[PDB]
Amino acid sequence: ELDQLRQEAEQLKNQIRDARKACADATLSQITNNIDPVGRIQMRTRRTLRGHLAKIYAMHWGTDSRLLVSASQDGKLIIWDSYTTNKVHAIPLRSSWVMTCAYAPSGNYVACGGLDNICSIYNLKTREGNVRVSRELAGHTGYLSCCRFLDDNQIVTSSGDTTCALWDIETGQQTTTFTGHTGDVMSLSLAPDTRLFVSGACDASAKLWDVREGMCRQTFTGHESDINAICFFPNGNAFATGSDDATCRLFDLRADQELMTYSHDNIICGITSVSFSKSGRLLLAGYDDFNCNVWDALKADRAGVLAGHDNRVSCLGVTDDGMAVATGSWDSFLKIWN
């Protein structure tokens, strides 16, 4: 019977909440109070990647920390060279309504997706010289957001149909489907160990997923609005979220509760993209108030404010060597800050 199932379901949820509360004894603030803060950090616009003619929706850095790809409102997917202003590639899209892009760790592939409910994989290194779409992936019933390459052959995609999917490129088939979110899933991040990935959804909850098993290993709450961003800590045992309620929270995998609430009273605009520094001390967070904010992740303060852009910062990335941070806003510019 439905009622007798739901009563014990909410009892079990209360049991989980009690287990989390008992397991928490000292907040991250109490023991991070001992160390001195990083102080004010004033990064500057080293490069300004102009060339888009519309609103930029996503970016992803390369594993070489020099190449990055950006997707804009116009049907264009540009691959940059961060050490210069050069455009390595600029490839058109079948659907201009692109909401995400990912750059494969090997650099051989770049993905994109959006309102077409399709993740398109582009082969960058071909003998033809141009860039050809390779096995555009269909099967999601909602707008696809924040696809990420697990490797050269497996890509995990999130869509606005409350599901996440794992694909095989040769036979695009949405092999593992991650179901259990109530609202649209906005962003996902991959753990460095390449075994687990967490996804944030519009149901004001984030779930940790087992890629091989396909089960929802862990679930996290605390946000009271749509979670628009998520990013793993560099060690893989923690992650940070950014939601429309203008607050960033630092969860962790070993426990099941939050550690920080990176929020400011003067900030009332939601977060669009969140990124971490190489050491994990700096929590970059792209905000809706036309500029990005730098947070000391161990502390709960604001080390610096990335200089304001012409529009809301929609995308954000930190190089694998941490040498630079790149933002892209709803204007047509990407900025590298170092």
Partner 1 sequence: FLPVFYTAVFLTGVLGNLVLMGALHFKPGSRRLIDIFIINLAASDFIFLVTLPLWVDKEASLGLWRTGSFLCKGSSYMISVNMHCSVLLLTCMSVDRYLAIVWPVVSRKFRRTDCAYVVCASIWFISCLLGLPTLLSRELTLIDDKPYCAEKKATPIKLIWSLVALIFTFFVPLLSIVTCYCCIARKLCAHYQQSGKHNKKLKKSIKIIFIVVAAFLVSWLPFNTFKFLAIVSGLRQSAILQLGMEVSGPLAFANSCVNPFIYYIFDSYIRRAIVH
Partner 2 sequence: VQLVESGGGLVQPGGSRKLSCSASGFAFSSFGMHWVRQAPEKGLEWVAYISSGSGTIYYADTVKGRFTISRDDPKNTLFLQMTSLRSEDTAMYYCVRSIYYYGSSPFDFWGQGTTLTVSSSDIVMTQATSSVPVTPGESVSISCRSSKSLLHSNGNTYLYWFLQRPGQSPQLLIYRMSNLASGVPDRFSGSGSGTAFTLTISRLEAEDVGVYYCMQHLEYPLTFGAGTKLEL
Partner 3 sequence: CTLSAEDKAAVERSKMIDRNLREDGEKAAREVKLLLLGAGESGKNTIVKQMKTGIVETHFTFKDLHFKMFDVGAQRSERKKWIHCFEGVTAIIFCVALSDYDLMNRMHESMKLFDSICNNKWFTDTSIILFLNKKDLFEEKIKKSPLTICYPEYAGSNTYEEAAAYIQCQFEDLNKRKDTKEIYTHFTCSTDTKNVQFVFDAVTDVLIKNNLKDCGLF
Residue 86 interacting with partner 2 (CB under 8 A): yes
Nearest of 336, 337, 338, 328 to residue 52 by alpha carbon: 328
Please choose which of partner 1, partner 2, partner 3, none residue 214 contacts, taking the beta carbon within 5 to 8 angstroms, the exact cut-off set by kind. none
Which of the residues 77 through 96 are near partner 1 (CB under 8 A)?
none
Q: Which tokens hold the place of 196? A: 């687990």
The residues, any chain, with a CB within 8 Å of residue 289's CB and separated by 6 or more, are: 267, 268, 269, 312
Q: CB neighbours (10 Å) of residue 63?
A: 14
**Residue 310 touches which member of partner 1, partner 2, partner 3, none, C-beta under 5-8 Å by kind:** partner 1
Name the 3-class secondary structure at 262.
Answer: strand
* 101 touching partner 2, by CB under 8 A: no
Tell me: does residue 269 bind partner 3 (CB under 8 A).
no
Maximal C-alpha separation, the chain: 64
Cα 196 to chain centroid distance, Å, stands at 14
Contact present, 69 and 101 (Cβ < 8 Å): yes
Report in angstroms how near the CB of residue 315 gets to partner 1 at its nearest. 18
288 belongs to the binding site for partner 1 (CB under 8 A):
no
**Residue 268 engages partner 1 in binding (rule: CB under 8 A):** no
Q: What is the DSSP letter of 234?
A: T
Q: Which stretch binds partner 3 (CB under 8 A): 19-27, 95-103, 215-223, 320-328?
A: 95-103
Q: Which residues pair with 115 in a beta bridge?
A: none
Selection from partner 2, partner 3, partner 1, none that 66 binds (CB < 5 to 8 A by kind) is partner 2
Distance CA 205, CA 198 (A): 11
Q: What angle do CA 172, 177, 180 make, to 5 degrees?
A: 155
Does residue number 225 form part of the binding site for partner 3 (CB under 8 A)?
no
Give the DSSP H or E segment for 5: helix 2-23
User: Whole-number minimum distance, CB 107 to partner 2, in Å?
Assistant: 7
Helix, strand, coil percent content, the chain, rounded in steps of 5 = 10, 45, 45
* Closer Cβ to partner 3, 20 or 89, answer by number: 89
Q: Which is nearer to partner 1, 116 or 331 (CB)?
A: 331
CA 214 remoteness from chain centre? 20
Query: How far, in Å, are 157, 195, 264 from residue 169 at the CA level?
Result: 12, 18, 43
331 binding partner 1? (CB under 8 A): yes
Residue 311 partner contact from partner 3, partner 2, partner 1, none using kind-dependent CB cut-offs of 5 to 8 Å:
partner 1
Q: How many CB atoms lie within 10 A of CB 130?
A: 9
User: Quick check: 311 binds partner 1 (CB under 8 A)?
Assistant: yes
User: Rule CB under 8 A: is residue 269 a binding residue for partner 1?
Assistant: no
- Binding partner of residue 127 among partner 1, partner 3, partner 2, none, CB under 5 to 8 Å per kind? partner 2
Instruction: Please give the structure tokens belonging to residue 50.
Output: 């102009």
For partner 3, how many residues bind (rule: CB under 8 A)? 37
301 binds partner 1 (CB under 8 A): no
Q: How far is the CB of 128 from partner 2 (least distance, A)?
A: 5
Q: Which one, 10 or 128, has the nearer CB to partner 2?
A: 128
What is the rounded CA–CA span in Å between residue 287 and residue 330? 11
Residues that bind partner 3 (CB under 8 A): 51, 53-55, 57, 73-74, 76, 78, 81, 84-90, 92, 95, 97, 99, 114-118, 138, 141-143, 160-161, 183-184, 186, 202, 226
- Binding region for partner 2 (CB under 8 A): 66-67, 81, 83-84, 86, 88-89, 107, 125, 127-130
Binding positions for partner 1, rule: CB under 8 A: 290, 308, 310-311, 331
